[PDB]
Amino acid sequence: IEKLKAALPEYAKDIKLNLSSITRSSVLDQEQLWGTLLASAAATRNPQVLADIGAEATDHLSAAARHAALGAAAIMGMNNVFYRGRGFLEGRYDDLRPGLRMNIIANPGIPKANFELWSFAVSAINGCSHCLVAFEHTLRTVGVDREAIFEALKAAAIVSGVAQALATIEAL
Amino acid sequence: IEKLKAALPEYAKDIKLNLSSITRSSVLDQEQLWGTLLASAAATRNPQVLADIGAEATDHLSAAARHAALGAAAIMGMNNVFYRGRGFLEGRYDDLRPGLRMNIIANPGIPKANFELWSFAVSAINGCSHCLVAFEHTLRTVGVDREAIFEALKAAAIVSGVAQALATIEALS
Amino acid sequence: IEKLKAALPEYAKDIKLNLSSITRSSVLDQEQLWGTLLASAAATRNPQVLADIGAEATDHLSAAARHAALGAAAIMGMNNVFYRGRGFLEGRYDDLRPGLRMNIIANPGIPKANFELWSFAVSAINGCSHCLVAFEHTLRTVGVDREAIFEALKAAAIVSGVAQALATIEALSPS
C-alpha cells in the first residue's frame, strides 16, 4: 500500500526504499511473495503494517492463502517459543511428547512449500533457528531455490523494519 | 479462557485446541499452572490475552503469587535483555557489577520455585538462553519434575500463539 | 520520566528504581544516554514509553540526534532479523548480496560512535549477537570504554523492563 510507504518517517528512508524494491521481487511468485509479506506483517504485531499489507495482498492472494499465511504466523507464534526453548535445553527434553496440536502444518489448505516459506519467514522474525533451519531444510528438499529462500528472509527483515519505523512515530 | 477461545479464528484452530487443554492440565498444581499462564500472558504483551487470563487467574492465586507472577514478567523483561547481550559479548563483560536492582529475585511473597518456574516461562517467550538454562538447572536441583518444567514451556508457547493470533484479528476485523 | 516512573506497578519497583538511576547516571554523554533511552524505548514498541521518553528527549537531545536515534532502531529492526537469520543458516547464504538499503548507518546525522552505541542497544533488545557483537567491536576500536558500552546495555535492559511493566498495568488497569 502506498499509504504504508507514505506513513514512513524521513529518517526511515532506506526502509521505504527496501519496501518498494521487495514489492517488485522477480525472485518469488506472487503467492510466495505476498504470503511472505502478509505472514511477516502479522508477526510484527504492528496493526498498521498488517492492515495495509493485508489490503495490498488481496489481489495476489486467494482467501485460502491469505488465511494460511495468518495461520502460519499464529502456529509459528507457538512453535518458535517451544522449539527454541527446548533447543536451549541441550536435548534433555527431546524424549518428551510435546502434545501440541499443529495440524495446519500438515494440511494448510494450500501448496505446502508456500506455507513452509511463510513459516520460514515468521521463524526468522521471532528468531528461532530450530524452526528456521527445519523449514529451510524442507524447502531445499522439496526443490525451492536458495535464491527464493533468501528473498523470503529479506522480505521478513524489510517488513520488520517497516513495522519498527512505524512504531517510532510515537514521538510527535 | 472462554472469551479468548471463542475469539480465535478457524485458521487458528490448533491454537484454540491447545489453549483449552493447557488450562485443564493436571501436571502442575493450580498455583504453578496459573502463575505460568499469567506471567506468560503478561510477557506476550497482548492486552487482550493478559486481561482474560488475568481475570481468571484471580480465583486460582493468592495475592502474593499474582504480584509475584506479574513481577516475574517485568523483572525478566530487564534481565532477559541484560543477560543475553552480556552472554553474546565474548565474556569481556563478566567481571563488571551490573548495578541493576532486582530485589524481587530475592523472591516475593512466595517460595523460590514457582517464581523460578515463572521466570523460566517468561525467558522462553523472550528468547534468553542464559536465563532459561539457569532456571531449568535450579528447578531440578530443587526437586521439580522435568515434565512440569516441560509443561510450563508448553503453556508459555501456547499463550504466545494465542497472543499472535488474537493480535491479528484485532488488526483486521 | 517521573510520570512514566509513577505509572509503574508495585510489582516493578526495581524497574522504577533502575529507570531513575539510569536516567541520572553520568557514565554516558547527555547525547549518548538519551539517544540510547529513546532508541531503546522505540525498540520495545510500547507507544506510551516512546511518547514519554520521546517527550523528555526533546530537552536533552537535538532533533537530529532524535531522528538518527529513532532511525537506528528502524534500520536495526531490519538488520537484526536479516543477519541473525543468516547466522542460523550457518553462513550458507553469506554469498548472495543482501541487496538491502542502509546508508543511514554510513551517514547518520550525528557522530558514528553514538549511532553505533544506540544500534548496539537496539540489537541487545531484538537479540542479534551478530549486530551486537559487530557494533561492540567498532565502538571499542574508536574509543568508548567498556564502561560506556556496558551502560548502554544496562539502559536497554531497564527500558525493556519499563515497557513490560507498563504494558501489564495498562492492560490490567480497572475497566
From Swiss-Prot, chain A:
Keyword Glycosyltransferase present in the record's keywords: the answer is no
The record's section on Gene3D superfamilies has:
AhpD-like
Q: How does activity depend on pH?
A: Optimum pH is 7.2.
The top EC class, named as a word, is oxidoreductase
- Cystine pairs annotated here are C128-C131
Enzyme Commission identifier(s): 1.11.1.28
Q: Which reaction does it catalyse?
A: N(6)-[(R)-dihydrolipoyl]-L-lysyl-[lipoyl-carrier protein] + a hydroperoxide = N(6)-[(R)-lipoyl]-L-lysyl-[lipoyl-carrier protein] + an alcohol + H2O
- GO terms for biological process? cell redox homeostasis; response to oxidative stress
List, in alphabetical order, the Gene Ontology terms for molecular function in this entry: alkyl hydroperoxide reductase activity; disulfide oxidoreductase activity; hydroperoxide reductase activity; peroxiredoxin activity
Under the cellular component aspect of Gene Ontology, which terms does the record hold?
cytosol; plasma membrane
Q: Which InterPro entries would you find in this protein's record?
A: AhpD, AhpD-like, AhpD_core, CMD-like
| Keywords, alphabetical | Antioxidant, Disulfide bond, Oxidoreductase, Peroxidase, Redox-active center
Identify the catalytic residues.
C128, C131
Summarize the impact of H130F: Slightly reduced catalytic activity
Q: How does it assemble?
A: Homotrimer. Identified in a complex with AhpC, DlaT and Lpd.
The record ties this protein, via HAMAP family, to:
AhpD
Q: Which family does it belong to?
A: Belongs to the AhpD family.
Q: What does this protein do?
A: Antioxidant protein with alkyl hydroperoxidase activity. Required for the reduction of the AhpC active site cysteine residues and for the regeneration of the AhpC enzyme activity. Together with AhpC, DlaT and Lpd, constitutes an NADH-dependent peroxidase active against hydrogen and alkyl peroxides as well as serving as a peroxynitrite reductase, thus protecting the bacterium against reactive nitrogen intermediates and oxidative stress generated by the host immune system.
Q: What is this protein called?
A: Alkyl hydroperoxide reductase AhpD
Organism, per UniProt? Mycobacterium tuberculosis (strain ATCC 25618 / H37Rv)
The gene it comes from is: ahpD
Swiss-Prot record, chain C:
Function summary: Antioxidant protein with alkyl hydroperoxidase activity. Required for the reduction of the AhpC active site cysteine residues and for the regeneration of the AhpC enzyme activity. Together with AhpC, DlaT and Lpd, constitutes an NADH-dependent peroxidase active against hydrogen and alkyl peroxides as well as serving as a peroxynitrite reductase, thus protecting the bacterium against reactive nitrogen intermediates and oxidative stress generated by the host immune system.
Substituting E116Q results in: Reduces protein stability. No effect on catalytic activity
Organism the protein comes from: Mycobacterium tuberculosis (strain ATCC 25618 / H37Rv)
The UniProt entry's GO biological process terms, in alphabetical order, are: cell redox homeostasis; response to oxidative stress
Q: How does it assemble?
A: Homotrimer. Identified in a complex with AhpC, DlaT and Lpd.
Q: Which residues cross the membrane?
A: none
The record lists its disulfide bonds as C128-C131
Name this protein carries in UniProt: Alkyl hydroperoxide reductase AhpD
**Gene of origin?**
ahpD
Q: Which reaction does it catalyse?
A: N(6)-[(R)-dihydrolipoyl]-L-lysyl-[lipoyl-carrier protein] + a hydroperoxide = N(6)-[(R)-lipoyl]-L-lysyl-[lipoyl-carrier protein] + an alcohol + H2O
User: What is one GO cellular-component annotation here?
Assistant: cytosol
What happens on changing H130Q? Slightly reduced catalytic activity
Tell me what the record says results from C131S: Loss of activity. Loss of interchain disulfide bond with AhpC
